[PDB]
Subunit: 278 residues, 3 copies
């Protein structure tokens, strides 16, 4: 059966997504997760919620233990991870209040543990070279988008629809993120360069979360929240969180409604075939 | 009220900017600075000098303790930091002997401690996400430029001047730097890519120094010396002359800083830090 | 030994056996242990030393390879040259799986690796070294690799001097640029498109800081890249890569002989001098 883990970013430091059966603390071979995990159900589907930055948002993007977080979710029996990521827009059609179901990224992070495998004592034995050309689980991506349609939230698909048919607030059916290391925001120079490369949004937390999920044999999809006076932004972002929560809840249900036997098996075999030491 | 900190790069390993009234060997929560700090006065203005690489230039750019350097200056009561930086050019209008008052950068460093805040045992508690769109203190930049004018040095501003106004040597009124980690220089491939991105100069020491200064609530401006990394004797003499010019600019700049009131700007700097504390918001 | 050729074997060369072993050296360096034991012997009359970058069982990922120990160990055994192999993915349509590239440029996207012998840390040599890297390889040694290809009847394609219709596969490209990513994951499509738009020819994980450290050590370094396919298709690619390994072996052995056939006194002196002149602490 499926079990859906949820990694909550900003706006989700302490989310009340459902009636919790209980709070759980776990450990992993790679250290402690960001915080304790909230266990519960969405209908008949098991769900686990984990705040990326910890309840008090005391852990910056570069110091988040992504391995521990993803591995904890794996060990709890999760088959899927849905993640939220607060982001800044680099393109005119992506405005604050919009969401993006990412399908691509460019990595500018460093100093973070980005693989479970290696030759150091603090890692699993072996050399894993994972294909990442299309880094997300496509079935899971499409579920997030269908969830938005189901909650009457506008979906904008730039290859199917013309620019004039972009109606805000909307979920962009695709998009690419540049993930910077942080914690500082980009300079104007950097943003112009990132925009020139054709990137859609900038964030700090997508990588290596997405990579580690694939290493763990888990189906992963990310929904980014465009947030780009402070009180107004908070109100807009608060409004966005309501809709993101709606999307996440519907998506968990949608995942539970389908059979994932072949896809899961494919996830696991992809890990096996990427082992270069074997 | 104000106190001007100066971080000396190459050519300033043993600054000697003024008669040292006192020296301070400090220890910060983030380690020891590059060397002892030298205190004194330029006119009536309090000033503190620190060689970024240490007296013997034994410390490479990636191993400089920028946090300790910036914090030590902060702890001494500095309100401003002026920094010098030796660089190579990526564009034809910038030639050896020129200077650049930077207003932008693109960061390609790594493995340096670039923030005071975080969840590590030695971090200040909290998460700080500073805006860096215009990463320098604009008032302090304009002071460097005006200081150059005051010392009869050509100032070139491509935004408002024809290219015929670019008379060498000149201080370029704006410019973007790529900061590479070092210690090696770039390949031709890398240089071509940086040039294509529209970057003006390349250096190894600007980041995270500029970032950490802003986290500290300090006003920071950088003056880059364009030199040649490709006859050695003529280049060295040229760089020697450049060092003299920068010394003059720095001295005039300290004087110009102390002549203005910085109450509002200092308050705004401190506020920006507090407003960027995500753990608090 | 006036000249002695160090060889760093990458994927396909975990357990190389390029010549009869004469001496198996278990060495330590100031920067730690090399990826494996070093195997000394001869190719004809030329002294030669071979070392597997990833160790025998290929257990060491690109980002965890001790490039300093590997280069320094070879320097310590008296090597004057380093020839290195590396597997890579193609970013351009003219470079197909089965081709080889004698690289002349790179763009570095590695991090977290020790990339210099010098510093202020106790784990480094005293001093600050700022090496020029505009053309990061030993040009003479590059031309040896290419001439070696010719001597073994392998197609050589030079884009600068030859027409595009003369690009006959499989072939050795006489020049090329690599982006070196940190790994261990391969690139996203987004990253590959960006790298291609920058004009880069191939992507690898092992070139940097190996090339940089070899120059720091005053050694003549040249690299030959094996273009493979990272996208039963697997059975076919494996077969192609096996043939690539065989041909690169022939190139390396012929290159060693070619190096042994010339004087290197001036070039070696220049390598040593470039190190000394790059000391910013003097």
């Amino acid at each position: 059966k499926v079990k859906v883990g949820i990694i909550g970013g900003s706006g989700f430091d302490d989310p009340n997504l459902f009636k919790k059966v209980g709070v759980r603390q776990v450990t992993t071979p790679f250290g402690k997760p960001s915080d304790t995990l909230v266990e519960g159900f969405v209908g008949d589907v098991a769900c686990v919620v984990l705040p990326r930055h910890g309840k008090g948002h005391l852990i910056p993007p570069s110091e988040v233990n992504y391995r521990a977080n993803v591995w904890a979710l794996k060990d709890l029996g999760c088959t899927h991870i849905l993640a939220t990521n607060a982001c800044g827009s680099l393109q005119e059609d992506l405005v604050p209040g919009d969401f993006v179901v990412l399908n691509q990224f460019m990595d500018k992070t460093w100093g973070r543990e980005n693989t479970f495998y290696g030759s150091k004592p603090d890692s699993l034995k072996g050399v894993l070279h994972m294909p990442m050309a299309e880094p997300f689980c496509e079935r899971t991506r499409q579920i997030l988008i269908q969830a938005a349609r189901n909650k009457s939230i506008n979906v904008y698909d730039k290859k199917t629809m013309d620019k004039s048919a972009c109606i805000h607030p909307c979920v962009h059916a695709e998009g690419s993120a540049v993930t910077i290391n942080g914690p500082r925001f980009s300079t104007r120079c950097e943003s112009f360069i990132h925009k020139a490369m054709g990137l859609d949004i900038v964030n700090m937390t997508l990588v290596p979360e997405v990579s580690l999920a694939r290493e763990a044999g888990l189906s992963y999809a990310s929904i980014a929240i465009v947030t780009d006076c402070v009180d107004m932004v908070l109100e807009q972002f608060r409004k966005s969180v309501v809709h993101v929560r709606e999307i996440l809840l519907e998506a968990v249900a949608l995942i539970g409604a389908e059979d994932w036997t072949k896809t899961i098996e494919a996830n696991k075999a992809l890990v096996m075939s990427s082992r270069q030491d074997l």
